[PDB]
């Protein structure tokens, strides 16, 4: 029951949302009585995580939009964690990038924030 790598590759919330939706539809299309009675924690965790991701603005996302956002941020020499956080949160306000986002000193430049907002809002 060993793990090979706990940090193999980071993924945004859209992939988790898609996986949860696929598992939910496959479940309701292949619902089994005994398998469900054996372990009901699966249903609970799946439904609650899907509801949590639905509460967030993660909706209205597609792989093309994610690829476009990644290609747009690649020109900003930003780290992977910063773009991951921006994609998971989708900040509409500037203060979210000014203070909440880490590594603000020397990275904002007071001019790139407008481009970041235009890219994340598109």
């Amino acid at each position: 029951m060993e793990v090979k790598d706990a940090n193999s590759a980071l993924l945004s919330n859209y992939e988790v949302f898609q996986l949860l939706t696929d598992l939910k539809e496959q479940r309701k299309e292949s619902g089994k009585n005994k398998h469900s009675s054996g372990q009901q924690n699966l249903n609970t965790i799946t439904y609650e995580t899907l509801k949590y991701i639905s509460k967030t603005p993660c909706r209205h996302q597609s792989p093309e939009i994610v690829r476009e956002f990644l290609t747009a941020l690649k020109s900003h020499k930003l780290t992977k964690a910063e773009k991951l956080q921006l994609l998971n949160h989708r900040p509409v306000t500037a203060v979210e990038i000014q203070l909440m986002v880490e590594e603000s000193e020397e990275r904002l430049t007071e001019e790139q924030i407008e481009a970041l907002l235009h890219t994340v809002t598109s």
């Binding site: 940090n7 780290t79 992977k80 964690a81 590594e103 990275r107």
Partner: protein, 86 residues
């Protein structure tokens, strides 16, 4: 005949003889201080090789600021065989 014992002997039996106190004088204190200084200075010496940390979580801009820098001694490869070159 020998009597029977209900409980086992104590794990640390008491002794009526105690260790002789340590020798005193400037020499012993100076040797102690020098040994402590050696302990403190030999760990930061390049010869003290530490366990190479691995499995970094992520890369960050602060890396260059937190990058551990330390001079490395160059072994004399003339005396050492060839099997130890990197």
């Amino acid at each position: 005949l020998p009597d029977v014992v209900l409980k086992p002997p104590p794990l640390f039996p008491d002794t009526d003889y105690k260790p002789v106190p340590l020798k005193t004088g400037e020499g012993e204190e100076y040797m102690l201080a020098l040994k402590q200084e050696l302990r403190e200075t030999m760990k930061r010496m390049p010869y003290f090789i530490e366990t190479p940390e691995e499995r970094q979580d992520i890369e960050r801009y602060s890396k260059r600021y937190m990058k551990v820098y330390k001079e490395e001694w160059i072994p004399d490869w003339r005396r050492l065989p060839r099997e130890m070159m990197p």
